[PDB]
Structure formats: structure tokens, C-alpha cells
Design a protein around this ligand. Sequence first.
Ligand SMILES: Nc1ncnc2c1ncn2[C@@H]1O[C@H](COP(=O)(O)OP(=O)(O)NP(=O)(O)O)[C@@H](O)[C@H]1O
Ligand SMILES: Nc1ncnc2c1ncn2[C@@H]1O[C@H](COP(=O)(O)OP(=O)(O)NP(=O)(O)O)[C@@H](O)[C@H]1O
Ligand SMILES: Nc1ncnc2c1ncn2[C@@H]1O[C@H](COP(=O)(O)OP(=O)(O)NP(=O)(O)O)[C@@H](O)[C@H]1O
Ligand SMILES: Nc1ncnc2c1ncn2[C@@H]1O[C@H](COP(=O)(O)OP(=O)(O)NP(=O)(O)O)[C@@H](O)[C@H]1O
Ligand SMILES: [Zn+2]
Ligand SMILES: [Zn+2]
Lengths: 635, 635
Amino acid sequence: DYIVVKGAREHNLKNIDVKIPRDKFVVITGLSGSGKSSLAFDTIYAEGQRRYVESLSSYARQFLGQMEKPDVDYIDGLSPAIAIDQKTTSRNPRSTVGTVTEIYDYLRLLFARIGTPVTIGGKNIYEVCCLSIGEAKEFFANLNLTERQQLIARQILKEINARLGFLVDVGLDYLTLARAAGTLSGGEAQRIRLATQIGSGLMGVIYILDEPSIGLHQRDNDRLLRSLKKLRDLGNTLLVVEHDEDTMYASDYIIDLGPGAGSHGGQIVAEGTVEEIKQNPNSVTGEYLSGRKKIEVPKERRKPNGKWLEIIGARENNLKNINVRIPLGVFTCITGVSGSGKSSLINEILYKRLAAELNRASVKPGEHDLIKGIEYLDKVIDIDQSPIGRTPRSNPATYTGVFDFIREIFANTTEAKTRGYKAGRFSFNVKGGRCEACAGDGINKIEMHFLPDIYVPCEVCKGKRYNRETLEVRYKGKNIAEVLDMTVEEALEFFKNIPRIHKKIETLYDVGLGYIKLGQSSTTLSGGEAQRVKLATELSRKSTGKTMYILDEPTTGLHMADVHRLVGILHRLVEAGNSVVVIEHNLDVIKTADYIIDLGPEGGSGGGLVVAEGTPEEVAKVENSYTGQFLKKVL
Amino acid sequence: DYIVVKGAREHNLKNIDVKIPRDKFVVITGLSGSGKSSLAFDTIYAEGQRRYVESLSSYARQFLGQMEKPDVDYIDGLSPAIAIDQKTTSRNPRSTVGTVTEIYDYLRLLFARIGTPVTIGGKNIYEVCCLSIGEAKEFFANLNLTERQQLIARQILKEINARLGFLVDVGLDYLTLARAAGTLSGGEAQRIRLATQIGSGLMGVIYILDEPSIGLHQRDNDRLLRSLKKLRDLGNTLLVVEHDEDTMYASDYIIDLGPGAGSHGGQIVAEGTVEEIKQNPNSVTGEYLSGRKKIEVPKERRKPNGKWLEIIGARENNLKNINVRIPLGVFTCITGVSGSGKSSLINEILYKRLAAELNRASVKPGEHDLIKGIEYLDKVIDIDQSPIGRTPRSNPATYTGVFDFIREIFANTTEAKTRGYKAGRFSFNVKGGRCEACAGDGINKIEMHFLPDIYVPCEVCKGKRYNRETLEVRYKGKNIAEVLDMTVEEALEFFKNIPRIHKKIETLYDVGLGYIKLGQSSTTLSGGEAQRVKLATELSRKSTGKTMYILDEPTTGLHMADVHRLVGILHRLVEAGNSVVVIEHNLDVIKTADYIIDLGPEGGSGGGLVVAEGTPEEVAKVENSYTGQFLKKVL
DNA sequence: TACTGTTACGGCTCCATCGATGGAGCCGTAACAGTA
DNA sequence: TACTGTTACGGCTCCATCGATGGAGCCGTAACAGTA
Ligand SMILES: Nc1ncnc2c1ncn2[C@@H]1O[C@H](COP(=O)(O)OP(=O)(O)NP(=O)(O)O)[C@@H](O)[C@H]1O
Ligand SMILES: Nc1ncnc2c1ncn2[C@@H]1O[C@H](COP(=O)(O)OP(=O)(O)NP(=O)(O)O)[C@@H](O)[C@H]1O
Ligand SMILES: Nc1ncnc2c1ncn2[C@@H]1O[C@H](COP(=O)(O)OP(=O)(O)NP(=O)(O)O)[C@@H](O)[C@H]1O
Ligand SMILES: Nc1ncnc2c1ncn2[C@@H]1O[C@H](COP(=O)(O)OP(=O)(O)NP(=O)(O)O)[C@@H](O)[C@H]1O
Ligand SMILES: [Zn+2]
Ligand SMILES: [Zn+2]
């Protein structure tokens, strides 16, 4: 009846005791970096999987793999749990939709066990696989089988019917089972990843969802919420780590983590229903929901000054040769249903053509006739929708690029010049200044065979990643280890007289990363922290006053406060005299835009046509687009 | 707090609802074939494993293997469960004790991760493996390790220490890790099989024990009971399916099944503590425990009539060249601690020499000088301690040997003679008279890849295993299918005028198998039913009036009523004028013997010497043997 | 001549036992080419 | 001459993905050899 956890200290949790109700829709909210993933996926799922795995043999334990033991005293009422990782998964070119969703295995088993010779229903496996999902579902539903065949193929057809029903319900009826899984959009890939594990509902099983609404429109989010409620009605428990308002409004219990991020968070601020969350002043999320603090919609929206970008004959992917006009000098946002073809337009035609024309790139653009107005811009800066890599040899300092400047400054010191030291000796990834015992890792990870891995600190370098000779040289009383061991605010105060580093450190601080350390490993970075680091890396570049920013879904893993900060930054950049084009699904960012280009009205082959275009007030008057329907309530 | 099961109909359970307390020592008792294994191992363990496996991926599900879905409505309060199968497991010659107990893997990991070059504590892996278990435990306990080494090897040494402690506690301190696992006795192999899975105790895990006291003396049973109580004190639940009195007296809760066996059982008769079980008249086990029905100890014990069998210089295995005298014409029982060397004496010297001298066998006997008194016997009949095979092409009718006579009788009919039918056409294991569609199996088993297997009956033969041509010929109004489809009592009534079949059917009925069908498959046979079938197969052979019976542990899987029936049969055979030598651990059988040969006083290299010898009253006066100490209380 | 012990000889069934390769991203280094 | 965009080139790291062989037992058939 409860999932009571007492004494949890994983990562940055400050020994919190939480009682999670069972057979409910419990949602964990909080700021980015607060510790929600460490609370759910790193503790509850880890403990459940470890308990279920320890009872198996050595072969099974070494094959499945045992997760690291969480630093939790005891957990009561645990049940077998299925969880989906927050980090997105790349797909091999050979993989298709059917193999990823595991429906291909059931199709093969059905054809092998029931197929009359390899032909069931007058069709071979090739015709079934090269078929639409809705067509396959309606063909399998109306299947005439004999008594013996129906008896044999019961648990084979039931699972296929359930999976196809879920895939139709989420809205993927236009896909084919032979289509490659790597060419799907963000929302389609997210839905496929969900359906791989949640389509066939079990009973008495805890379902852990780590941001299941990535790249999904509000209309798709409503359908997924209805599907999740239907699954929960089977008698399961759902724990959803989300940032959207709809999920909070459609949840029975809300658990809030905070009150900040990093070292300032990891606690529990408020608990209860939505009304209890709103009435609690200590909750930042509750205050934002109640409207006490909100994103300010502009009173007057800027109008184009006669400068326009014209795209003529854009027919990339599913685009039906449309003509789109993007105003220059104003904040432009593009909205559409998941799969309508907005990224396939912008990131595959406009950004590539702009880069080829201005930055002298060598990337082939999309299928289009011509673009008018390229001469009005000087350079193009873009943020892709692809995820960032995670390696132990990476950190914010070496990712945003301040590490090169810091190393050059350290090599410019008198002691380094006397000792004949270059800039490469001060990096832990090049031999010469890295402790050879631990290969500059700082710690040594001992890998077992079936037992969980154990981390032991290095003794030669004490964990400072550098030998004694390199740490001797100090700049302004600090060596490189203490340089990498201070937060962003301390680095901002330290490098205040060096503009080259100060600009990038100020950019990092602006997005809200004043608590992070310059040497924190990338593998330990949160999803929201990694997204904000990627945003700051591109926003730290110099602007010439006539530039175009192309941001593709920067809301991934960002709380309401973080997106408010990003909105403020983008508005300041626009007011400076630059043009920003944002492909967004969050209503808060769109409701402040000065221009909206709407695509749809559906996804897949059914979309690719401009439905609405103009200011948000004018777009809200169009009943054809669901974006207008949502903007009616938002405005 | 409970393991509540409602609506269980697996095998022969008549929809019983049982509430099993948690964190206790619950013991399930009942007659042989009542349905205890079907209640615990086929339902609770199956449901728990299925629930824990369904949450994994397709690869994991197909690798681990999903057990058949039990026919149970719902089970509440299940947790991860570890169970040990009742059926014994043979061991390959290459396997040793360390590899079977999984301590070799931990030794290899310790030597690879901590060993200084492959040498920890001044010894290589060869010296550690070629060492006594007690010596290895005391060497590992007093291990001097540095700070880093102790930090690294914590969960490696803890498991080794726990496993060696359990192996010392059970009483296997005389074994070596390099000793082959196939050469151990029954009790040693049982203890090794236990230690493989129960040595390292977990928390909040259900432990299911399926007869864990096979081939164990009472002294070893007490030690194992103390170890089980220590493990249960860790906060686990133990469900023990046993037949001994000590386990019932040392259990918190007792659940009694019955009231009979086969189709007459599968119910629940009484529940509560030991006093509640005794006070309930409906429980056969309770009545036997309370002394209302008990095995009658003879008032006067027969004395030898001057006929003796002398074994001189028996030095097989661990025997220290002892001289043993076995009286002839009386019921002789041999008692000793597990591993003392009683089977290695009898079954390896006496039986082999008797078979070679009388039955003209070609089996090499053990290491001994000579045997005096072989000329006093005519033939030797023995029952080994090895388990019986289980194949779908086997049944009691074809195992006890009545199938050959039945087939000859069927081929002797007028219709068979007219049709040119031989005896082979009436067997389902030979082409010609079996349904070729199912190859005589009767049912077809469809095998999936990861899903549980589904059994579908054959349609060509309707499940009668024979075609239409063979079923036409009927003997006394019954064809071969109806012959195989009647119980043992019906066969006894049917074949009452044919002594050749009547003798074997009466032998089968005597041991208490009047409910079994002649065509029931061996794979579906219970352990006790298989043991009784094996006993009847050898007891059905003709006796010449001067014969020797050598029964090696016939109590395996037999209830008190079954062993009472066997004791009566053996006493009648002895009174007929034959000599019976029984290697036994059950006190009920020994307490009625007319002569006892005691071996010990310990196991392994510490035993092999005759401690006591004579009538049970005289043996009970010896304080050196634990058998005398137990007979003091028994008598 | 029949019953009963052993053996062989063929066929069927059950059960124990034991991570690597390709694709993608990131960091450090070098080089080339525009702007300022 | 400095800042900044692009490219290449080598090295390190992370993540997706996909049951068989030998040993033992049992059943049906045939043969050989003692007892009765
Ligand atoms: N391995 C680690 N070692 C140390 N700190 C870590 C590690 N992993 C994460 N952290 C920090 O722990 C805090 C909480 O991380 P995490 O629980 O992943 O955040 P989160 O609330 O789920 N954020 P987000 O996913 O963006 O919503 C952050 O400050 C992380 O930087
Ligand atoms: N390489 C490709 N070949 C064929 N079809 C494609 C390809 N890439 C994308 N598509 C399809 O084109 C449509 C639009 O894709 P895309 O424009 O990437 O989506 P999107 O608008 O960014 N959706 P989302 O990321 O969910 O916001 C979808 O039906 C995709 O399945
Ligand atoms: N697969 C099966 N199909 C049909 N009947 C079966 C099957 N397996 C077992 N049985 C019968 O079900 C009854 C109970 O079997 P089981 O539950 O194994 O007995 P048990 O009480 O554990 N006996 P024992 O192990 O000797 O103590 C017996 O009459 C068996 O012959
Ligand atoms: N082939 C063998 N080689 C060496 N030692 C052996 C062998 N077989 C058995 N032993 C040992 O000889 C001792 C007696 O074995 P054995 O006589 O078979 O035991 P037992 O008395 O029948 N015990 P149990 O079956 O438990 O009642 C034990 O220490 C065994 O480990
Ligand atoms: Zn080091
Ligand atoms: Zn058939």
C-alpha cells in the first residue's frame, strides 16, 4: 500500500523520507538538477532490480548485470518494476520499427507456429511487415482461424493486438513495420521507445517514467495521458518524472523536490494534491502553477520591418512543396504536431543553406528551389535536437571551450615559461601532466564480473588528476586543480579582468549554472544541466548584430524557471537586433513569440502544409490548427 | 504479512485457499502424493518466478526461461523466492566441490583482483583449492590485508566467509575444494546442493525447501535445523516440505494436506501448531505423531540360528580394514552418520560379491580379503540409492514389467492371430501400432521460444496413443487403451486368473499404489510414487526361500504410513525365511530391527570403524555412538 | 520345454554446464581562409 | 597581427544488439546360460 523509503542519500539527497502511495498516478516535480532522477531511477528502480536479481544464479546475475547498490537504508513494499531511461537511445540503420517494438519476433513466431506452407490470412510475412500499423491492426483483428489454430495462437495474437492497439492510440497509425527506426523524429522515437516496454500492460507492476513527453505536442500529450490512465486502471502504480502542467493536473499525488538545485537541493518541499501544491508557498513549482510568478507575455508585439526570408518549393521529406515566409528581426516560433515536418523544413533546408552561404560549409541542403533574403544575414548559429555525448573526459569547462583559454593563460605564466611547459601539459587528456597511475581519471574504477563495481580513489595523485610537478605552478595563488575545483560564480569573480574567459563564464552563469563546478564529469551531468550547457556553448559565441539563431527544442529537461530564464535571454538577444527562430512545443515560449508559423494539420504523410501563420492572436482565430485551440485558452 | 493463495487447482488440488504466514518456519506435511510439491513448488515458486521474469526484456525472458503458468486465481504478498528441487541432480566428472558451491568463482575473482604477482597470503590458487574446508576457513579468517586491499575485497571475502561457515556448520569440514562432486554420498551431495543456494543468506526472501533431509542422519538433521533457524532469524520466510518428526516439532506453523493421495487428496485437513495438529483427529500425520497409530516394535527379537556372513579385511574407500558379521535369517539394519562408510561397505563389497558368485554377474567388487558364508544363499536382490529416470515413454506398467505379459496376452487373442499381429504392435514405443501423427505420445507439446509451452491433445488418435486398426481387437471386452486406463485395483480384479500378472499387480497394490493408473507417465510421477514403484519392481521378483534383500534407503519420499507398510512387507518376507539387510536412517525402521551394525563414529576419513553391534537394546547401551543415544529416547 | 538371471544392441529422452562487434560522439592538435 | 568560422586526423569512451554438447537412464529386441 506504500513504497516507504527512509534514509536515502544517493547523489545529492539530504536523507529524505518519502511515502509513495500505490495504485495511483504519482508525479515528482522540481527544478532541474533537484534530484528527481536520483530519487526514482537511481534508488527505487535500482533497489527493486537488485533484490529481484540477487535471488538468481551466478550465470543469470552476470548476464543481466547488477546495478550499483543505492545508498538507502531500507525500502518497503517494493514490487517488480519496469523503467524507461531519460537519456535517448540511438538506433542502428539495420533496425526497423517492428524489431524495436518487438512485434517482429511475435510475427515470426506466429508464422512459424500457425502459418500454413508461411502464409496466414493469404499474406506472407513481407506483406504484413510492409504494411501500415492501422491496416495491420485491422487485418489482425478480423482474422479467421480454426479451433486448433485459435487455441495454439492465443498468447501470440493477444500481445500483437495489444501492442498495435497502443501504437494506434498514441497516434502512429501512419508508420510501416519495415520503416527504419533511426529516421523517426523526436516524438515518434519517444513513442516507439515507450511502446517497446509499456504497450503490453501487466498487473501489480510499478511503472517508472523518466520524462515520457519529449518532443510531443500538447495533443499527443493528452492522448498519452489517457493511455497512461487506462494502463493505471489495470491495477498498477505509475511514477512520472515530468515538467509539464498537464501531467501535474492529471496526477493523484504530487511530490516536490528542491528547494533549489545541485548542493542547494535534494530535499522535499511540499506534498499533496494539486491544490495542496498551489497553496504551499515554499514550492517554486506551486508558485509558478498558481500564477504568482509567470512568464510575461509582451503587451505589444514587434512587427516586421520589411525584411523577410522566403522559402519557395520546400519539398523535403513529407513537405508538399509549400511556400513559407520567415520575418527577420523578430522572435519567430514554429509550432506543429509531432511529425508534421517542421524540423525537416528548417534544420534540413534553411540552416544548411544559410551555413553553406555564410560559413562556407560543405553540407548538402534539402530539396528546395531557392531562398530569398540570405544576403540580409551575416552568420547562422544553431542548436540541434540531437542529444549530447557523455564521456568521463568531458566537463563544462572543456565543453563550452574555456579550458583552452585557461590552459593558455597557465602556460603564459613565468614559471611555466621557465620550465618549458606548453598548454598541453595542463590537460589531463594529454600525457605529460596527467598522473600516469590513474591516467588522469582522478579515481580508479574496479570492475567485477557479476558483483557491482567499486570506485576507489587514486593514491598517487590523491584525486587531483595532476602530478606534483604540474601543480607547483600557480596563477594568482591557485593551481589548475583549484581552478577546476571552483564553481561558476567563483570563476566569474576570478577571471573578471580577462574578457575572453569572462564572456563564456557569464554566458554559463546566465542560464542558471552558478552552482556547477568547472570539473564536474559529463557522465555525472543531469539531463537539464547538459541541455543548459549545450545552450550556453552556442549562446556564448559572438554576434555581429545581424545574425540568425535556430534553436531546435531547447526545453528538453528544463523547468519553468529555466525556460523563463531562456526566454528572457532570447528576448534580450532579439532586442539587440537579431532574428531568432525557435522550433518549440512548450506553450509558454510560443505565447510570447512575435510570429508563429504553423504546420500540419497532422503528422506523417498527412501533414506538411502551412495551416496558420501570423501573430499568436491571429493564429488563435484559426480552428483548423490545434495550436490555435490551445492558444485560445492560453491567451 | 501473508502469502494468501485463493483458488489453486494445479495438478490434483481441489481449489484450496491457504494463508501462509511470513517470517516464520512453516512446514507442509501430508501423505505421499497428497499434493505438497504441487502446492509449493508448482504454484508459489512458479507464480513468483513468472512475475519476476515478465518484467524483463525478451532476451532475458528467453534466456532465463519462463515456467508454466500455474492454475491459480491470484497470489498476494509474494516476494523473490529461491527454491531447491526435490529431484536429485547428477554431476559431471569434471565438476568439483568448489565449482558446484560457486566458491571457485569467488576465489578466482579474489586472486585476479587482489593477488600480488596470483599469490595472496603466501599461497597460490592450487594450494587453496587442494585444502580442507575447515583449514581454508581458518586461513581466510586470519588474513592480513592492507587498507586498499581490504577496501577492494570486501564483498568478495564476506561471501567466501559465509559459505565456508555454512559448510563447516553443516559438518563438511573434511572435504577438499578439489574433490570431485560426483563421488560424494547421498547426504554429502544433499548438503552441497543446499550450500550452493542457501549458504549466503539474503533479507526478505522466501526460501522453499523440497525435502532437504535426504540421506541425513538425525545428528546432521539437528545441525541443519539449527542452521535453518539461524537463517530464518535474518528476517526471511521458510517453507519446508518434509516428512520427519524433528522438522514438525521445530516449526512454528504446520499445514497438513490430504486426506489421502492421488485423486483422493489435494485438500487441506488441519492447520495450526504441533499441539493443534495432534489434537485434530482428521489428520493422519497428527494421529501418527500423537501415538494413536504407530509402528509396532516387536516384543521378542529373533536370534541368529548359527548362520553368519563374515566380511574380513573390508578396506573400501574410507574403511579401516574392519571385520563385520551379518547374521542370516533375521532382519538386519545398518546405521551410521552420513559419510561413515556403510554404503561403501555393503553396496560396494557384499552385494557385488554376492551377485558375482550367484547371478554370474561381471561386476568388479570392492577391496576386501574374502567373504565367508556365501554358500548359504541362493540369489541376491537389491535396491540402489540412485534415483530413477523419468521419461514420457515410461509408466508403472512398463516399469514393473507387466507390460510385456499384457502385450503377449493381447497378441495371443484369436483376432490378433488372424490379423498377423505380434506383441510389438501393441506398444506405443514401436512403429506399427502407434499413431504416427503424435508418435504414440498421445498429446502434442507445442514449444515456444520465450513464452510458456502449450499442450494440445492429438486429434487423429483422440489421445488414446493407438490407431483404429489396433484398438479393434479386444480381450475380455477391453482393448489396450482401456487396459492402460484403469487403476491398479481394477487391474487386480481384471487379471485375477492370470498368476504371472497377478503377482506383480499384487506387489504394486501392497506398497499402497491402488489408485495409480497403469499408463501414468513417469515424468508426471511423484517422488514418493516413483520410489514405491522402484521398490515394488524389485519386491515382485520370485524368492526361493533362501535369498538376501539389500535395500539402500527406501524411505526417500515416504510418509509414516508408507514406511509402516514397507516395514510390514519386510517383516513378512523375513518371517517367510529370508534375510534382509537395510541401510536406513529412519528411526522407526531401525527400532524394529532384530540386529544393528553401527559404523562411525564420524564421517569422512574420521569414520569407517564399527562402534556398536548387536540388538537395539544392546546398541542403546553404548555411549560412543549417537545412534545409541537416540535409541535411548526411542526405546 | 518353461521360468528366470545375466549380457549386448539400437533408439529415444532428460538434465548438467558453460560478451563481442559495429556505430556515434568528444577532446586535443593542426591547417586554411575570411574579417577587423 | 589577432579573432573566429570551417575542415581534417588521431585517440578514447559509451551504447545498441543479438542455446549447444556431453553424460546418464529407460524401453524394446535378441541371445546365452542355469534350474525346474
Ligand atoms: N554521479 C554523480 N556524482 C555526483 N553528483 C551527481 C552525479 N549524478 C548526478 N549528480 C548531481 O546530482 C544532482 C541531481 O541529479 P539528478 O537527480 O540527475 O537531477 P534531476 O533532478 O533529475 N534533473 P533533470 O533530469 O534535469 O530534471 C545534480 O546536481 C547532478 O549534477
Ligand atoms: N529520412 C527520412 N526519410 C523519410 N521520412 C522521414 C525521414 N525523416 C523524417 N521523416 C518523416 O517526416 C515526417 C516529419 O519528420 P520531422 O520533420 O523530423 O518531424 P518533427 O516535426 O521535428 N517532429 P518532432 O521532433 O516530434 O517535433 C515524419 O513523418 C517522419 O517520420
Ligand atoms: N504432470 C502431472 N499431471 C497429472 N498428475 C500429476 C502430474 N504431476 C503429478 N501428478 C499427480 O499429482 C499428485 C500430487 O503430486 P505431487 O504434488 O508431486 O505430490 P507430493 O505430495 O509432493 N508427493 P511426495 O513428493 O512423494 O511427497 C500425485 O497423485 C501425482 O501423481
Ligand atoms: N569414489 C570415492 N572415492 C573416494 N572417497 C569416496 C568415494 N565414494 C565415497 N567416498 C567417501 O567415502 C565416505 C563414505 O561414503 P559412503 O559410504 O558412500 O557414504 P554413506 O555412508 O552411504 N552416507 P549416506 O549416503 O549419506 O548415508 C565419504 O567420506 C565419501 O566422501
Ligand atoms: Zn593518480
Ligand atoms: Zn495421434
